[PDB]
Amino acid sequence: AGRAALYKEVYNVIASDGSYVNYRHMALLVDVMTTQGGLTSVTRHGFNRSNTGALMRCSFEETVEILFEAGASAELDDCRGVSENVILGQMAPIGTGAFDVMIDEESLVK
Amino acid sequence: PIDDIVKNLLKFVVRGFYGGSFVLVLDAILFHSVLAEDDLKQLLSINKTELGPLIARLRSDRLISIHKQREYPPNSKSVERVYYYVKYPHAIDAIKWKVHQVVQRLKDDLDKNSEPNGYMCPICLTKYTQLEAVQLLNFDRTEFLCSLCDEPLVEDDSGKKNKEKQDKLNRLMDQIQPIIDSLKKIDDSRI
Amino acid sequence: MFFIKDLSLNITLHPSFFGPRMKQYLKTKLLEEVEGSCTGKFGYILCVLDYDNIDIQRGRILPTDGSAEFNVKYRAVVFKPFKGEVVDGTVVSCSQHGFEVQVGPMKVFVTKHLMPQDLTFNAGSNPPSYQSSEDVITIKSRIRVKIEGCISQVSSIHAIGSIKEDYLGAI
Amino acid sequence: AATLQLGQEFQLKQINHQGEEEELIALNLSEARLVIKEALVERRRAFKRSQKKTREKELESIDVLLEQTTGGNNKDLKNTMQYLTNFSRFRDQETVGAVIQLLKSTGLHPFEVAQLGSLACDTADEAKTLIPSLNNKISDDELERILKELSNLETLY
Amino acid sequence: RNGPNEHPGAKYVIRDSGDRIDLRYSKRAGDIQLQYGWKVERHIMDNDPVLFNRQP
Amino acid sequence: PNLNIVLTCPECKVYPPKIVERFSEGDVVCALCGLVLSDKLVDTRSEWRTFNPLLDGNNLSTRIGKGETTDMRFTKELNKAQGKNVMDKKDNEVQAAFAKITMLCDAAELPKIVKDCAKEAYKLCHDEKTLKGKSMESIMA
Amino acid sequence: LRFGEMERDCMIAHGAASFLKERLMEASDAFRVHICGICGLMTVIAKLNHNQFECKGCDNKIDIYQIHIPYAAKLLFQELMAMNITPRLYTDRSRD
Amino acid sequence: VGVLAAQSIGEPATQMKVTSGVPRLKEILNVAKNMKTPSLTVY
Amino acid sequence: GQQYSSAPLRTVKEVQFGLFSPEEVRAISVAKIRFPETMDETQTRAKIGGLNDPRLGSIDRNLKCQTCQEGMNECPGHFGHIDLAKPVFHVGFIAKIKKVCECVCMHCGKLLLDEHNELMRQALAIKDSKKRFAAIWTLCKTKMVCETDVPSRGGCGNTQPTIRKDGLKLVGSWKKPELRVLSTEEILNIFKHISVKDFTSLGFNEVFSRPEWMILTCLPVPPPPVRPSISFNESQRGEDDLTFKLADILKANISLETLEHNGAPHHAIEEAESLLQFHVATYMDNDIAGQPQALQKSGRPVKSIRARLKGKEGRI
Ligand SMILES: [Zn+2]
Ligand SMILES: [Zn+2]
Ligand SMILES: [Zn+2]
Ligand SMILES: [Zn+2]
Numbered sequence A: 001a002g003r004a005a006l007y008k009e010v011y012n013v014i015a016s017d018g019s020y021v022n023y024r025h026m027a028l029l030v031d032v033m034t035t036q037g038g039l040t041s042v043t044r045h046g047f048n049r050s051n052t053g054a055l056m057r058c059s060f061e062e063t064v065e066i067l068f069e070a071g072a073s074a075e076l077d078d079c080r081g082v083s084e085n086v087i088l089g090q091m092a093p094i095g096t097g098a099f100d101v102m103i104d105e106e107s108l109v110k
Numbered sequence B: 001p002i003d004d005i006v007k008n009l010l011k012f013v014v015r016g017f018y019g020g021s022f023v024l025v026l027d028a029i030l031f032h033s034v035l036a037e038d039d040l041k042q043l044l045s046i047n048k049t050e051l052g053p054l055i056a057r058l059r060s061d062r063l064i065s066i067h068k069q070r071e072y073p074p075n076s077k078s079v080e081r082v083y084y085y086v087k088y089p090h091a092i093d094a095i096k097w098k099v100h101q102v103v104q105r106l107k108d109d110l111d112k113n114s115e116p117n118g119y120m121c122p123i124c125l126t127k128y129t130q131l132e133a134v135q136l137l138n139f140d141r142t143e144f145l146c147s148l149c150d151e152p153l154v155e156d157d158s159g160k161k162n163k164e165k166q167d168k169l170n171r172l173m174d175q176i177q178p179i180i181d182s183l184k185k186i187d188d189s190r191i
Numbered sequence C: 001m002f003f004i005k006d007l008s009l010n011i012t013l014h015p016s017f018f019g020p021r022m023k024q025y026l027k028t029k030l031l032e033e034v035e036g037s038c039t040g041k042f043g044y045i046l047c048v049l050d051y052d053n054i055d056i057q058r059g060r061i062l063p064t065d066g067s068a069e070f071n072v073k074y075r076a077v078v079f080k081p082f083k084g085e086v087v088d089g090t091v092v093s094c095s096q097h098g099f100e101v102q103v104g105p106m107k108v109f110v111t112k113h114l115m116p117q118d119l120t121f122n123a124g125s126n127p128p129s130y131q132s133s134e135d136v137i138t139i140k141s142r143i144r145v146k147i148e149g150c151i152s153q154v155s156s157i158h159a160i161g162s163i164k165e166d167y168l169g170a171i
Numbered sequence D: 001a002a003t004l005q006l007g008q009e010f011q012l013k014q015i016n017h018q019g020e021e022e023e024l025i026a027l028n029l030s031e032a033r034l035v036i037k038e039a040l041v042e043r044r045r046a047f048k049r050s051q052k053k054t055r056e057k058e059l060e061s062i063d064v065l066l067e068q069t070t071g072g073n074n075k076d077l078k079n080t081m082q083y084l085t086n087f088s089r090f091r092d093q094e095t096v097g098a099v100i101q102l103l104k105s106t107g108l109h110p111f112e113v114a115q116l117g118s119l120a121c122d123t124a125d126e127a128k129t130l131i132p133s134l135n136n137k138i139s140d141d142e143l144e145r146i147l148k149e150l151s152n153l154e155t156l157y
Numbered sequence E: 001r002n003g004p005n006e007h008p009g010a011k012y013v014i015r016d017s018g019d020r021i022d023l024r025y026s027k028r029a030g031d032i033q034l035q036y037g038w039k040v041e042r043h044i045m046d047n048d049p050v051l052f053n054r055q056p
Numbered sequence F: 001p002n003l004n005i006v007l008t009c010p011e012c013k014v015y016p017p018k019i020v021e022r023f024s025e026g027d028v029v030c031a032l033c034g035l036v037l038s039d040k041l042v043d044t045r046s047e048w049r050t051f052n053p054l055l056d057g058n059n060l061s062t063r064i065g066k067g068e069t070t071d072m073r074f075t076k077e078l079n080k081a082q083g084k085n086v087m088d089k090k091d092n093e094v095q096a097a098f099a100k101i102t103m104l105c106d107a108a109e110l111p112k113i114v115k116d117c118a119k120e121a122y123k124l125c126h127d128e129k130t131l132k133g134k135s136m137e138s139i140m141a
Numbered sequence G: 001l002r003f004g005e006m007e008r009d010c011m012i013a014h015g016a017a018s019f020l021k022e023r024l025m026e027a028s029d030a031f032r033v034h035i036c037g038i039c040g041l042m043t044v045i046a047k048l049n050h051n052q053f054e055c056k057g058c059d060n061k062i063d064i065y066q067i068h069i070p071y072a073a074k075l076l077f078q079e080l081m082a083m084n085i086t087p088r089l090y091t092d093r094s095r096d
Numbered sequence H: 001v002g003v004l005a006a007q008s009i010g011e012p013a014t015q016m017k018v019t020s021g022v023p024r025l026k027e028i029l030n031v032a033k034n035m036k037t038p039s040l041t042v043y
Numbered sequence I: 001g002q003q004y005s006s007a008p009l010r011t012v013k014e015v016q017f018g019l020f021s022p023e024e025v026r027a028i029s030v031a032k033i034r035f036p037e038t039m040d041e042t043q044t045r046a047k048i049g050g051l052n053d054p055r056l057g058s059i060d061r062n063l064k065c066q067t068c069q070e071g072m073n074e075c076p077g078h079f080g081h082i083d084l085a086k087p088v089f090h091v092g093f094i095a096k097i098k099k100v101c102e103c104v105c106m107h108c109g110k111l112l113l114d115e116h117n118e119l120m121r122q123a124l125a126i127k128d129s130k131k132r133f134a135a136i137w138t139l140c141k142t143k144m145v146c147e148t149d150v151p152s153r154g155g156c157g158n159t160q161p162t163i164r165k166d167g168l169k170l171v172g173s174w175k176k177p178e179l180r181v182l183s184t185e186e187i188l189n190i191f192k193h194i195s196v197k198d199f200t201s202l203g204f205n206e207v208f209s210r211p212e213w214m215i216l217t218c219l220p221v222p223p224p225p226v227r228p229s230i231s232f233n234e235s236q237r238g239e240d241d242l243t244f245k246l247a248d249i250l251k252a253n254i255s256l257e258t259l260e261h262n263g264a265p266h267h268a269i270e271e272a273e274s275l276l277q278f279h280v281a282t283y284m285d286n287d288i289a290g291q292p293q294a295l296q297k298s299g300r301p302v303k304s305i306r307a308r309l310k311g312k313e314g315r316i
């Protein structure tokens, strides 16, 4: 019921503005706010207080605190996040780079 | 008794490895079990800046422990008096460990001069070992060059310096034999 | 020591070498780079056994440049020195710090201080030779050297030997 | 050092490219020459297959015929062949099989028997001084016997 | 052969060795012949897709 | 020990570097064969934008003053700590002497050039042996 | 011109990672550094005029990795090392 | 799809009984413990 | 355009964040940095052994950076160090250390309560490290007495004091009331007596983080590639703020060593210790609340590393 009610609340402001937005986007947004149980705020206290990699959380707002807690607690980063691959300066798993291209030597003789 | 042999040990070590004022303070504590700071100042007639480094040196060697005793007598003045006390076991342990470190540090210097290995470079003032020497050997040259200077090196170390490290061991043993004998005499009763 | 070990190497090929015969090229490269060279982890690579049954696995395309990367697993005969290893060799170059013994593809050096007292250096001879109380160490002479230490740098390996101990010296 | 404790890739436990476990292969300077000189022959057959569509002179001549096979970038292997040949006293793989039969009969480490077969000694003290790992792992009389049979297996070629 | 001054020209050449020669002061040398494997930097001609953007 | 980077053209090698520096492109190029000598040129004007060796030398120091959110007790404890370390260097006479000389020059309405020349002269004299006193007034005048 | 954060977010919205990598490396700044196998820090002294490498404090002269990171990221790592924080980099996945 | 949704929701925010508009959107996204107009619809 | 290298080229995958151990700092560094001066006495080159010596990195292109050689466009930089004679605390950890002081005994160095307590048994079952340290802190912060015998255990019993943060310091209050200020050496000693299960039950990993490592003992010195100085007109040379902070750390450290070598006024030692703690604290984070703000001689606040990593349009 909290989920459906949240969807109604968001949809209301959209329809009030006199605009149309597809069901997909609003559904995705609502679901993200409810996948950890309860209601989760969209804040710097609402996704930087849960693990996603030290870089991904530190990039948004409070950099030094997140980094210090990371080094203190010996945290490990998986480094498949978007911002992480951006910072390191190499290909990320998004779109074209979400798959590797290979070669088949058995196909060259065709 | 065993307690007096510790006193003679502290006299031999403090007298043997430090100046005179150190055994002045040391004996000043051996005469009075609780020696105030004002008594040592009016005794040796030394300044505060002269009594400081002496007590700090006797405390850095774990020879004596201090006891800052409170005072609230006559004029209601919180007169604090640093009473010095001889710390026998920590001082004996300090003497034994220091002797062991002297023997070990004087034994390592003998193995270095027993066989020359490394080299030296006068031009860039950089030291090179035998490894870098054989790694900087060329075919068109007959001597070990230097990456910084590409010029020949000079053999470092020699057998003449090996005669100095042995005399330090013999003289150190002849000057440490009574001390280590007193240590072996005190360590029998573990006091 | 002359050991045999299965080694793996990543071969890079230019996009111009993608013909049907490319496998041969691989082996070609697999020879030209591996045989004769040296590695600080496996020693001097001598030969490469098993040339017909060379595994090719699967080639992968790295992003930019478009070059192809391959992971090859093969069997090879390599030579790796070890510390405190009695070997034999022949002198090549002579120096006042000691003569340079040649053991296979490795040029070991023997320090003068690591030599007995009776062995003295002689520069008046041509070539300069080390003359002792019974043996004369010359270039073409064979000397049994006991290697004391070895250095394993990348693509470069040098060792240090000695002949002071018994059962050593000239052969 | 020389205390039966080599590196990581040189440990007693080795793994082949198939995934199975294999003991470390240690070779002495006897069959080590017949294996290089051996494989270079089949390598010459492989070089002449795709082409369609006294003891020192033969050594250097064969090393030249095999140098023409390679791309002139591995002459240290040929100089190593001259080193081994100048320091080798063994010949024929049958006698080498006998030598392995005499080395494996004592139950020693492959590196130890490699140092045994690679060194020319007359007494047991020589083998115990040149090989620091062998000093009490095997009897001295047995080592002297092995050196006797080996002394009968060596022949001036 | 046109030069950096003219629009249908180039600015820098990059040999296969990974070295850049500027077309300026290169006319003092005389002739510059291209080979297979080099990278010549040309000017933006026609039919060249580029990203267009407007903040924010 | 060396540490001197000298740019030369390996293709020309006919004369010491007679080169030209292209700042707009950020390169340095030989003015003969036209071959570039270095890419990615650094600037000195750009690092200077954010910001005295002739008098202060290589000495560095930093002030401690009160903060936005702080206590007055900590400001005094830090200044008293510097008051105990002020004897570590004998440079207190230069700042006080330059302060009083600053007051006299500002009282005489002399330009800043005479002030800097007088400060430079007092820095050249400072505390030498041939001075041997004069009670700080005569060396200032 | 400045390629801000919103522009990068638009490039992610289009799904073009190669143009983002090229724009954030070759089009701006690209640096090459060496890291050590045991510790993922940039202490690897590289004297490659004779092909020589070291890493101080962990006894390595063989296993040295080469990585291409932007200069700003190297400034971040060096500032973290100046701030007593270890940004260890590993080319292999130990967690699996 | 996350960036496309965040844009598909953020773009109509530029054109902007109970409170509507940007303040209401702030209360919804922040998940505030109190609303500007806490009303019900009793059927 | 950089020079070719023979090292194998790979991408950057896993990134591990951990604290810098003082031994590793001394193993990474190459210089000691003892002279607070910038350049040499001859107003040229470098001081050689100072704030910016050739043992670190260099700029100006023409210089070669002794220990990498190559050039500035290739030099990653090199690290120095500073060996202090008195341990100092790190700003971003002052709270955490305090929490540790409220989670472990101050004498025998053992965790308060025990595994026999039911609440501790329930709290230890949590897999999240931060929540474990949080709840265990909520339990251990109340009990102010270690105990020797607990019915169904270590000894001690000494009344655990109340640790309060005041002026970058930690004051301990005993009721018994005897209030004594906890020094850095005492806290570091107690941290040296912490067993494996103790700090690993708090959320520490032996190979990466240690409570002893949280207390700063040796300080890394970043190369000029991080703080590039300028020499404009050869007579107007500007040094970065971090360079001035390093000069302050050197002057306070040498001053404290000089005051602790000959004599001991007991008060000037605490003034110099708080001075060095202030220079290191402002070096790590100048914008610290409740503490004075260090200001440069030009009239602007000192630019710290945290300021470079905090505000917008910075490094992130
Ligand atoms: Zn030199
Ligand atoms: Zn030129
Ligand atoms: Zn390392
Ligand atoms: Zn450098």
Ligand SMILES: [Zn+2]
Pocket: I105, I106, I107, I108, I109, I110, I146, I147, I155, I156, I157, I158
């Ligand atoms: Zn306790």
